[PDB]
Subunit: 223 residues, 4 copies
């Protein structure tokens, strides 16, 4: 029904393995069409090497019901859905277990801004969520994963339009952007700064976060 | 005699270098046919770039005798054989010296479950065996390697159907699955969580294992 | 106007992703034509996969004005320009956020010469600049970035003709050479010794810099 | 004059970049023909992408004089020559600055045998030479590099036929084998165990070397 959108999502999903952000069939990308009140996401149970635009599922932003698609949508759909409702300014969402961002997630630590690379895409510390409670995990898990992300941002007063990424404790990174592609680009940068953050800490364990002035210069410049 | 099986094993063996789990000619994959009472394994002394389905050797589960094949079977055949007898629920076995899982093996340490990535494929700590005794090593080595793996699981009360992987002290990883391919996939995940485990420990040296509830959620969900 | 130069710069810019020194559209290479009093640099807002020789911008060494080009020049142009004026003996300049050199930059640490690999291309410690002041950052930023590099070399008495590289605190590496290509080669070596420096320090935290005699032997030999 | 030999050396040299053991034009492989009293080595000043069998230089084992070749031989030729004279049982020599083996070399540390991977190709600790003296470095450098390697083996009573590799302090690895190809394979394994050695030490800083029985089992088995 939104072929050009299914195209953008399809291509973004195929970009995941190309940029070495995923292995096997992990990861998923989706894009939203606000006026349509629906979002398109990667299908569940489909290899990237077989995946076609027609496999992309159409889901209702409001009810989470599949508006079009023969395939089952990604099991992470509720999280995507929740985030679209919570963050009005986002147009695309990426979820992967990219190695280095996931290392930070598993460590339960937030990625501090120590470089201009990071400053160009994330306005400050990339937050790692608190652990989910036993209740949240055994309840509507994916949806709750979304709630934990949103709570993290509200409690810490972080603007989602200025921080297109987050780490889910013991799980992995979630990133987003203006559209499917933009979302994928933010995901690849999140992985890059995660990688560099590990080793810059090793070289300088008592390294202070970058100068606020430098952070501002680079983030405010773009956007 | 089981061309379709020799095909599955051949392709799984060719997948090893493609997924960067092996170098030169290290590694080997095999698949079993219970009703036939035989398993098919990679040949010894054959480059992956030359390897053909006909090179796959057929071996007796009960006697370890080669039922069909011009080439000599992998020197690890006894280990595979032992594991098939010991673990009834397995249909394929992978052995490699994939770098990161091997780093843990050489360190003689078990890979703790610190993420959902790990939880999705291994139900808990991926065990590293104790060192083999001088007698075991100088006896029927490969077979003894199998016995050490099995003892590890029995002593620690770990169900092989829920933990498709193990690290052999000072040696390397062994993984298995429902079939040759499934076995290969578990092998690649074992390498991924081994990689991430190294660095998540570095970021958080006193990091506790993941929440049991989270572990259960992810493992019990699949399967 | 200098097609053969735009060719050299174009090809050098396309070499950046090929040598895994860049991601997305980061990085930029330029080459100068002293007699012409102009330098050619990568355009801003152009994917490497689309980039053509015609996209290369021509800029005035003296005024920084674009002498020819439909596209906007890289935002790092002022830095390049400043460096050409400051260092007469350089013919090409490379700027990237290559992961490992950037890790050192973010750590705010200089890369010590601990090997012959390093000695072959950099005559001594590869310097990391001091942090830029709030004023410098909020002023003519790129130009000031150049001034900080130059001050680093003058204060520390380092000859730019013998040290074709520098790390900008919290930012990334800048490298240069006799021409666009030579500049790119120095950039790739800077990344290699940055990578090895991290881990050689890990293996030997109290490792002294390499023998001066060895350093001299290798650097003075070439050149 | 020995086209089939120039072929083996050519192909081995082209294998260096393919196995990611080299960058730019670093590294060199050579093979010897004892009965002929000559060895063939990679030429100096030739990109791997242009390199042809005819570019391979023929050198006298006894005098180090070029018996055939339009191109200048690798600057490491004296080292190769010395090693051929010193170690009668070797038929090929590889020299690279492969990242991880070089990290150990720069750290001035020997790679301890902590795994079967290592045991399969190197019978024990892979030695790192002592630092060269100012005199050795400023004398016939490459030849002296060879003498330091040989002294290392004699002083420590290590059989070159059982240890096809060595690390030259602050420099890089040298490996050898029965022929050009065998030499290249040993070089790639040296890099693999160097990589794993770094991180296995990190996981277990007080890790003892592998069981002698295990070391013997694996090395004595092959060969
Ligand atoms: Zn996930
Ligand atoms: Zn093995
Ligand atoms: Zn930059
Ligand atoms: Zn060298």
């Amino acid at each position: 029904m939104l072929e050009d959108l299914k195209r953008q999502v399809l291509e973004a999903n195929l970009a995941l393995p190309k940029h070495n952000l995923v292995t096997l069939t992990w990861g998923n990308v989706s894009a939203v069409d606000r006026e349509r009140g629906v979002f398109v996401i990667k299908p569940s149970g489909v290899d990237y090497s077989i995946m076609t635009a027609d496999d992309m599922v159409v889901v209702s932003i409001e009810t989470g019901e599949v508006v079009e698609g023969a395939k089952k949508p990604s099991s992470d759909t509720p999280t995507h859905r929740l985030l679209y409702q919570a963050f009005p300014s986002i147009g695309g969402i990426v979820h992967t277990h990219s190695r280095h961002a996931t290392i930070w997630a598993q460590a339960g630590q937030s990625i501090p801004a120590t470089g201009t690379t990071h400053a160009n895409y994330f306005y400050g510390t990339i937050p790692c969520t608190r652990k989910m409670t036993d209740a949240e995990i055994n309840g509507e898990y994916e949806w709750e994963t979304g709630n934990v992300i949103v709570e993290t941002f509200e409690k810490q007063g972080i603007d989602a339009a200025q921080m297109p990424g987050v780490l889910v404790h013991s799980h992995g990174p979630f990133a987003w952007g203006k559209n499917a592609e933009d979302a994928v680009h933010n995901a690849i940068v999140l992985e890059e700064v995660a990688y560099m953050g590990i080793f810059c800490r090793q070289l300088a364990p008592q390294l202070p976060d970058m100068q606020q002035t430098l952070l501002n210069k680079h983030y405010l410049r773009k956007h």
